[PDB]
Structures are given as structure tokens and as C-alpha cells.
């Protein structure tokens, strides 16, 4: 298969990418070095997930290195919540890109479509642990991101987390200058997507699937949690092609257009995944996966549920 998907601005997003959260800052900046060195170009990154200072390190050592060069690598940050505000996502940006070592972003994404209240931390609470909310609304924080592509400090814009009527919304902006040239959301066998993803491509947006090996690392799972890397429905259609479980649950978003950023911070399967170019599953197999999905969903705030925002409560 093709490395590279087309993206709505022109350029062109490798289809596997790595992804950092939860990648501990001791050992991410050796996973970018490795995933580099085995072949990945495309690294998903926030200033949220307070490793980018790391993962710089080593886009920066392989560049001097000569391993790569820039316009070979397509990096991937994301303006976290509490910098909603016009006048705060340019040093979110620029922020970011200090971190990152980097004169630009190739992508860069509303993390989330709920703005919280700025300041120091992440998650700011009410007495009661309901998260404090911005005013500001998704269309003003998109004019800011358009702002960042005239500007020069990335190359794409786009959203992550958002449903369909939040993407329309941004579709039918008035004077909308540039449309999201992708859409990261959670999506896996036991959380499909399909209908989300069908609105999204047909706009001509990317989907980006992330956890999609359902993040059995998240803090918050528990003991008796579905698990897809366990599920012996898969690891069956994996044995069948002589491919880990792992290998099966990134090229399933491959082969539904979509690009995939499975984490690791372990050498062998960092390596591991990315050797999913060069086999196919069947149309009875895409299928057969499909019909695992629960709406089983792992990536959420509960501190969140009453914000005006909040994704999740459409259908899709
Ligand atoms: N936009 C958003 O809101 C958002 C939300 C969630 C995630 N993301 C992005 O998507 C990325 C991926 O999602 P995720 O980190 O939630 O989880 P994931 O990629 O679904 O799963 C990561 C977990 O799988 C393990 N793993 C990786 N390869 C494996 C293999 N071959 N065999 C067995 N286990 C394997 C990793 O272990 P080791 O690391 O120990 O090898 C880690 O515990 C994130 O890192 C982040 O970049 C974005
Ligand atoms: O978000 C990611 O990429 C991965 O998850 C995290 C990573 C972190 F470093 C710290 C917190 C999270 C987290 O709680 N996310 C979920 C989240 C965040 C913001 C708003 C909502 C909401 O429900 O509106 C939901
Ligand atoms: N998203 C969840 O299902 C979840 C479950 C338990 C938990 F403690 C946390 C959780 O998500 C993170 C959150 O609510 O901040």
C-alpha cells in the first residue's frame, strides 16, 4: 500500500505515524531515534502530553544526523484546551515548536472542541471537580488556527475529537478561509466510527485513528476492560496471516483510508508495527472486524460531561 494519503491543503500525511502519550520522558526520545531509523516519518505529538521538550531531541539528533530530512518527517501537534483564546494560540504554537525544535508544524490540531479556563493547569476545577469552561467558541479558535497557516508556523490545520455536527459547524463557518484538513478521533474495532467517518471523508477530511490498539496503557483502565490485542476473534484473523495481533489492528484503519499512530515506547514493536505494508486483509476480514464495535470508547473527561462542547453526547 501507498505510504502517503493526499491531505485538502496539497500535502501529503504518511498513513503511519507514531504516537507519544504516555511515552515516559526517559524513554520517548529513544523511540523517535528508533522509530526513525526503522522508518516512521510521522510523529503525533501535544504539548498536553508534557514530552515534547523529548520527542524534539530526537527529531532534532536525526535531522543533524542526516538520517532524514525535515520535509521528509510530517510532525503533528495539538493546542490544548486552555488555550482556546485568540490571544494565547500563537504561543501555544510557538511553544510547542520551541519544544519540538521545529520551524513548523505539518499538522496542527484543536486537540480537543472544549476550550477550558487559561492558566497553569491542564484541567482547571471548580469546589465541585467540574472542569471550568472558556467562553470562547469553536469558530473563533478556528479563525486562530487559520491565522497560524498565514503566518507560516504550520502547513495544515485541523480537529481531533470533534462529531459531526462540531465539524459541519466549522464547514459552514462564514468566511471560513481554510477547511480542517483532518480528524482525529478515537477509532478501533470495538468503536468503529462508521458513521463519523463516512461524513468526515466525504467532506474530503482525513480521519486519523487514534488508540487503535485500544491504549491498554491508559491510566484509567481496569482489570475486566475489553482487550483487543487479547480478543481471540483477532489474534485468529492475526495467525491466519501469519502477523501479530498488533500488525492486524493498525492495517484495518490503513485499508479504511485512514491514517493510524499506534504507540510504543519498545524498540522491537515499534519496529514490529510498522512492518504492515505488505500483506492484506480481505474484504470478509475489514468486514468481519467492523462487527466488533460496542461504542466501547476509552478517551474521555468525566470532569467534561456538562461542558456546552463536549463531543460525545451525539450519536456521532
Ligand atoms: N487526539 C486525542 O485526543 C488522542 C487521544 C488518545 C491518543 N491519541 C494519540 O494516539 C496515540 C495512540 O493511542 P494510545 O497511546 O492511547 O494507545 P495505543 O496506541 O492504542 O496503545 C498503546 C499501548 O499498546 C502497547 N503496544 C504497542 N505496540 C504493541 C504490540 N506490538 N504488542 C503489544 N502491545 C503493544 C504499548 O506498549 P509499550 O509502549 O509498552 O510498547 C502501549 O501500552 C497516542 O499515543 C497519542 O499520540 C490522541
Ligand atoms: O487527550 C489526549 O490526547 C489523551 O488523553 C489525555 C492526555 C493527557 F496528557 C491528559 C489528559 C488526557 C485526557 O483526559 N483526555 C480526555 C479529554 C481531554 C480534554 C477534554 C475532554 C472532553 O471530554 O471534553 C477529554
Ligand atoms: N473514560 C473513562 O471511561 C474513564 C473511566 C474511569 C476513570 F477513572 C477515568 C476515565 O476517563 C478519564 C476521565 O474521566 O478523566
Not at 505539518?106 to 480537543?112: K, N, R, T
Not at 480481505?282 to 476509552?298: A, E, G, K
Request: proline letters at 6%.
Amino acid at each position: 500500500m501507498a505510504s502517503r494519503i493526499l491531505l485538502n491543503n496539497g500535502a501529503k500525511m504518511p498513513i503511519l505515524g507514531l504516537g507519544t502519550w504516555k511515552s515516559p520522558p526517559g524513554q520517548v526520545t529513544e523511540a523517535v531515534k528508533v522509530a526513525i531509523d526503522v522508518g516512521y516519518r510521522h510523529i503525533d505529538c501535544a504539548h498536553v502530553y508534557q514530552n515534547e521538550n523529548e520527542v524534539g531531541v530526537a527529531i532534532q539528533e536525526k535531522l543533524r544526523e542526516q538520517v532524514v530530512k525535515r520535509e521528509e518527517l510530517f510532525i503533528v501537534s495539538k493546542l490544548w484546551c486552555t488555550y482556546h483564546e485568540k490571544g494565547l494560540v500563537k504561543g501555544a504554537c510557538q511553544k510547542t515548536l520551541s519544544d519540538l525544535k521545529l520551524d513548523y508544524l505539518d499538522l496542527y490540531l484543536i486537540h480537543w472542541p472544549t476550550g477550558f479556563k487559561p492558566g497553569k493547569e491542564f484541567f482547571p476545577l471548580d469546589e465541585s471537580g467540574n472542569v471550568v469552561p472558556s467562553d470562547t467558541n469553536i469558530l473563533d479558535t478556528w479563525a486562530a488556527m487559520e491565522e497560524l497557516v498565514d503566518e507560516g508556523l504550520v502547513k495544515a490545520i485541523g480537529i481531533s475529537n470533534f462529531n459531526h455536527l462540531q465539524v459541519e459547524m466549522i464547514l459552514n463557518k462564514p468566511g471560513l478561509k481554510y477547511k480542517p484538513a483532518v480528524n482525529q478521533i478515537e477509532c478501533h474495532p470495538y468503536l468503529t466510527q462508521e458513521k463519523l467517518i463516512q461524513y468526515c471523508q466525504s467532506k474530503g477530511i482525513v480521519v486519523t485513528a487514534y488508540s487503535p490498539l485500544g491504549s491498554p496503557d491508559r491510566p484509567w483502565a481496569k482489570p475486566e476492560d475489553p482487550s483487543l490485542l487479547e480478543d481471540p476473534r483477532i489474534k485468529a484473523i492475526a495467525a491466519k496471516h501469519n502477523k501479530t495481533t498488533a500488525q492486524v489492528l493498525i492495517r484495518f484503519p490503513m485499508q479504511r483510508n485512514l491514517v493510524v499512530i499506534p504507540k510504543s515506547v519498545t524498540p522491537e514493536r515499534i519496529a514490529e508495527n510498522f512492518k504492515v505494508f505488505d500483506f492484506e486483509l480481505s474484504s470478509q476480514d475489514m468486514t468481519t472486524l467492523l462487527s466488533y464495535n460496542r461504542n466501547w470508547r476509552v478517551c474521555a473527561a468525566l470532569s467534561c460531561t456538562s461542558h456546552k462542547d463536549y463531543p460525545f453526547h451525539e450519536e456521532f
